[PDB]
Amino acid sequence: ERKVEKLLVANRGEIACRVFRTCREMHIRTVALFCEAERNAKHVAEADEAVCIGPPPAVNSYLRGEHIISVAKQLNVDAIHPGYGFLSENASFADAITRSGIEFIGPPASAISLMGSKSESKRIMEAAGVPVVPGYYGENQNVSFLAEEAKKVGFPILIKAVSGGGGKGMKIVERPEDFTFMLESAKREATNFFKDDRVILERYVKRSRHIECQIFFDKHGRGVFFFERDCSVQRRYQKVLEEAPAPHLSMETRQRIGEVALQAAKAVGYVGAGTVEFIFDTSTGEFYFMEMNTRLQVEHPVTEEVCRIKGAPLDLVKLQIKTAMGKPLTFSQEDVTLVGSCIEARVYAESPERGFLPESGPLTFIREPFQGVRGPARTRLDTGFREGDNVLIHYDPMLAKVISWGRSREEALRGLRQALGEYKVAGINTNIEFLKRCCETPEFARGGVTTNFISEHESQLLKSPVVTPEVAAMAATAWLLNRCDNWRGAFRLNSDTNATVHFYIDDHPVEVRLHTEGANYHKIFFSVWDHDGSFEVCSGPVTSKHRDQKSIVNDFTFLFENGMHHTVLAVATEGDVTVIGSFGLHQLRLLPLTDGFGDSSTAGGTSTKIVSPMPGKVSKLLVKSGDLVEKGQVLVIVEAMKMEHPVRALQDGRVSFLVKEGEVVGGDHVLATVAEEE
Amino acid sequence: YAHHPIDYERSTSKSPNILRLPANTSDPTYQENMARMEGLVEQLRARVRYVQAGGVVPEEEAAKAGVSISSIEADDRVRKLHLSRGKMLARDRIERLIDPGTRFLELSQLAGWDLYWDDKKKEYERCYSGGIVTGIGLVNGVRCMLVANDATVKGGTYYPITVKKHLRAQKIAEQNHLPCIYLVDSGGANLSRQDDVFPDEQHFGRIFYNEAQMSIKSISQIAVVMGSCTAGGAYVPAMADENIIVARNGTIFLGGPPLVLAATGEKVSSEELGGADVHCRISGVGDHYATDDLHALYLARRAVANLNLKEHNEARNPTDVKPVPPLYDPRELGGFIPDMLSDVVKSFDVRAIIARIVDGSRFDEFKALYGNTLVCGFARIEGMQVGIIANQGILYSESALKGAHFIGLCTQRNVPLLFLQNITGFMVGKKYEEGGIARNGARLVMAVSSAPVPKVTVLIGGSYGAGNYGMCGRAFEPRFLFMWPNARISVMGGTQAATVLTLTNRNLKNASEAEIAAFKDKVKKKYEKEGSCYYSTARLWDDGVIAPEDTRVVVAEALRATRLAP
Ligand SMILES: O=CCCCC[C@@H]1SC[C@@H]2NC(=O)N[C@@H]21
């Protein structure tokens, strides 16, 4: 075999840190890669050496496979792990690595190329004999052929069409012995949706739930399938929350899922770690092949919590290095046993209220949930970002992954709830509120959720706590104090103090007024939305005198008269005030009040504009008539004894020319009328 | 009306009107200008290198400098012979003397550039510098003036450009209360141009006058005697709080070794005639006797240390400050500058330049709707409040009034002033003359000259005529002057003088084409033969020459130079 002492990573993020960590235990060197800048990132602070690769766009960075290979050769690298994304699925890169002599980590290039095309892949599995639900059989040569194979090839009837998602030819015709309505439905589908007259028939499944078993193989002909998984929950083809132990799955089935999976991988030949994905209908009770991926998934640490080998913790990445080592395995499929249950959820730096659009901004304060064992449950968090970091728009929005291992499902789900609640980030809106809403009200604790489970409950979700009038009181107070000495040393005569804050909550401005009575800075009141009360407030140490973009992060205490007390860590800026406490997190936008403060001119500008002196001789006018002029460009240039003396009018609005180039004009002539755009 | 802030937000935000947002688009016009500028700086930045290590440029590719080819071997031979003696032939004494990690200015550079025409028609005197090098230096936490006599004695020690440079340095130091350090190496005098350099006023005697007037005001001065200083040059070692004589090659004489011959010619060793006499002689002349160049420089530094100025400078100029850069890239300064040699004056702007130079790209406009020609307002330059007068167009009476008002406020509140010179631009209209324009011009010049505020001017371009009297000029005591490459200093008219002087000079009505060839072309050649590169600096007219891109750093050096003042 070939010794390995240097490890190379392609991608960046959580996978970089994960690959780097275990490496320490195996006692192997590490190498990091980073784009323009991106040098303060954590992963590079974790490796032994890092190299800059070039411009931010993914074409420029992490896609120059030849340059990466040349750099690795110069470094005499032993192994490369592509990870997921970028060159994860590219057979040319793997072949070039093999020619260079470096041990590529993953499947051979032949498997990747074969699975690149869906038609040839499904051909291979059909030849292998795995139950596969195909996409098409022939064409609509005859309408009687539809009745011929309707009860033949596939009893379930999937009429549909050659293409297009309209699918009005379907009509949900699950009843066999249908011969006068299927042809009428197809012919009415052909109208206004002719496309190609060829029609394909398949089996139609009422329900769908996604399954995906894991597999592992050495290069000495020996492997063992890991435990199954579930990915029923996904929105817009994006993974949201998943469970390694498919609840409600019989043991016997588990076993069989393996025999089918091993047949397919052996047929194409496979080395390393991979995952086979199925599609399943509860009503039919059978699973049909949909797709496979020849690449390590992102969901690898999840399935790990439900599998132990020889009573020892399993490390998936470890074996992949050992597989690259050339050593053979040590365990049969038997040594592996499941223990308990676990659940996972992904947090995305997106805004649930909006069109789930990514946002980029500095990370102000990041609470870290307790990543230790307690009670009947294990909870962990893996994050590829830390304090002081900033999200890049080029990358996908992905902060951290939270997993709750437990002895029973209940324990696991309950654990997450509390953890999901505890983790807190300030600075960018996240979908963390959405995930908690997905966990509380939906009765998916039973364990039965379909592929389209998210679609129906969209009305129930997308809901957040209501900002109580009290929340404005602590939020408003923090912005003042966390900016200046408002209410500090203040003093007037025979009167009392007053200071107000305007919040632009939703599309309606909000005003909050704060004032004091007595000689007390401590005793304070409030009146928001016609609700009045009293409270006292005690601050903490003063921090962040520089009041930069991060501004001031301080803890606050508020004793309201009723009797309560509160603690609030407020990082306030001019743009917004963020308050985090037992209520949760809420950011209140401050009413924006900016509008070219100075240049606010509504003057008509009717006549006598950019008038030229006596000599005249206007020429070389470079402004189009009827075009807005707010900045002071040279509207007209007139020459008086070689005196260009450009007028440079700054009156806003479009300018209308009444003169032409080369025309001698009199003194103080109306060359143009600079009027407000009407 | 639905608007109720507290001034900030409106202020202390990245959106205050105070700033400026002139963003260029890099179009042909920009290219034409930006490119030319580049065409106006490369050699500026280059000749400097050639005079540096003067006459020895091993690359031999100095075609970017129009300097004639010189005998490199002769200069290398002279330098080898001089360095074999044991003394460092370079400006090396300076950067050895100044603390590492600190700044320098090089006040006057390219001095005496191709000044004198020799007997050989194609040959000029090879004065790569003025014979000395002058710059502001910070020694041991103390700001000082550094004057070093170059070892170029082939033409003669001192010229009408050398003594003027020395006297300018002395006047600057006295005005600013910066102690001086002189590095003395001389060939005596120049017995060829002696009438031009010895007698009269503002000559070699005024050096001796200044070295005593300084010590009256208790501004200690230091001189180092590396080589001979004869012919009245021996008084500076005598008139000095501290002086240094090198053990072997340091010599001071009132009468030359040839002079003892033909008048009791009992010749003896040059050591005994007044050189470094380390034998405990009766003479108590010369404070320090140092065995080596490094030893002498070290003792100079040690003497500079014991002056107590460190506390005063540290208090006055904060050493630990946070640099605030402008909002726009300083490389863009060359672009807004128009081209050159254009029949009719091209267009120009100021806002962009000030927005590029000042801190945070901001400005504090006074009345700009009124007297739209002239620009005046406050600013910020590296932690110090500044006033700027930059000229744009043809001056009016109202522009002069606004200038007088601004200068009045600046003098009232003790704010320094910066000047950015431009065209003369005095209208000649009869109504304007009838409107008492002369009185308003006098109003402006009176305030300009009367101001006790420190004043610095920098040439933008096109400073020709008596208009500079309105803004500022060398004859109005500017404590520093610096220049950009595209500068022309000439008669009241740069282009019009051609037209006017065409009419009134012994011209027949006929032969018009031959006459305009003989008149207009000739006067154009005369009035643009002068330029930034030759007529200025080389003659210590506006002694400083800089780049347009690095102006703010230079002005910040100047302002820190003018706060030790009483
Ligand atoms: O508008 C036409 C009058 C231009 C006056 C230009 C002034 S007059 C004196 C000085 N010499 C010039 O050539 N330009 C300025």
UniProtKB/TrEMBL annotation, chain A:
UniProt keyword annotation of Glycoprotein present: no
Out of the domains of life, which is the source? Eukaryota
What residue stretches are annotated with the Biotin carboxylation domain? 3-459
Q: Which UniProt keywords apply?
A: ATP-binding, Biotin, Ligase, Membrane, Nucleotide-binding, Transmembrane, Transmembrane helix
Q: Which GO terms describe its molecular function?
A: ATP binding; metal ion binding; methylcrotonoyl-CoA carboxylase activity
Q: Does the keyword Zinc apply?
A: no
The UniProt entry, under Gene3D superfamilies, shows: 2.40.50.100, ATP-grasp fold, B domain (3.30.470.20)
Instruction: List required co-factors.
Output: biotin
Residues in domain Lipoyl-binding?
600-675
The ATP-grasp domain covers: 122-325
Gene Ontology CC terms: mitochondrion
How is this protein named in the record?
Methylcrotonoyl-coa carboxylase biotinylated subunitprotein-like protein
Lineage of source species = Eukaryota, Discoba, Euglenozoa, Kinetoplastea, Metakinetoplastina
